[PDB]
Amino acid sequence: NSNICEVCNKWGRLFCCDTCPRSFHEHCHIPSVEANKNPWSCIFCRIKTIQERCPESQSGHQESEVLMRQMLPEEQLKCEFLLLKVYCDSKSCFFASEPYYNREGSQGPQKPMWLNKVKTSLNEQMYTRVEGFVQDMRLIFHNHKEFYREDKFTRLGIQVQDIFEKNFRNIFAIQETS
């Protein structure tokens, strides 16, 4: 097993996956690492099993159809994994905790949003459809763009959104286009 957390790339108190060489801090894994369960399999392994049980799940899909899906266990898992993939980028630190807004020439967004709030939302089963989760995620980056305006710091929002969108297209097998 790896000696660093797969998500934050730091050492510490790690839990090791029994079916692959990854390890995680307790609260870096999503969902949080389960108390007992031996063996334990991490979210990467659980996502791989879904694909292996239903190979046709990887054929291309329309984004509009994916968003209307109800949050049954498998879609819940996919959204957990997608969130995890955003936390895996170190630039996610900017979007993790609750932001505040006091900048000359800007006003704060009407509906603030941040990764830990989406984390809690998923944990408390507050989304009924994929759409709810995807709208909150995209809102994080859109609030950022709008607030920081022409400051170069806007680019951090573009960068983290690109990681989200790539991972969304992969995990949910969105049909490739030009």
Interaction of residue 140 with Zn ion, rule CB under 5 A? no
Residues 6+ positions from 170 with CB-CB distance below 8 Å:
none
Pick the closer one to Zn ion by CB: 43 or 134: 43
How far lies 131's CA from each of 7, 47, 68, 73, 169, in Å? 25, 20, 6, 15, 14
Interaction of residue 88 with Zn ion, rule CB under 5 A? no
Interaction of residue 8 with Zn ion, rule CB under 5 A? yes
In the chain, the largest separation of any two C-alpha atoms, in whole Å, equals 55
Pick the closer one to Zn ion by CB: 75 or 131: 75
Q: How far apart are CA 38 and CA 80, in angstroms?
A: 21
Q: How far apart are CA 58 and CA 60, in angstroms?
A: 6
Candidates 2, 4, 16, 20; binder of Zn ion (CB under 5 A) is 20
Pick the closer one to Zn ion by CB: 47 or 113: 47
Beta strand 23-25 pairing with 14-16: antiparallel
Candidates 29, 30, 33, 42; binder of Zn ion (CB under 5 A) is 42
Candidates 15, 28, 77, 156; binder of Zn ion (CB under 5 A) is 28
* Total of residues contacting Zn ion (CB under 5 A): 13
* Interacting residue ranges for Zn ion, rule: CB under 5 A: 5, 7-8, 17, 19-20, 22, 25, 28, 42, 44-45, 54
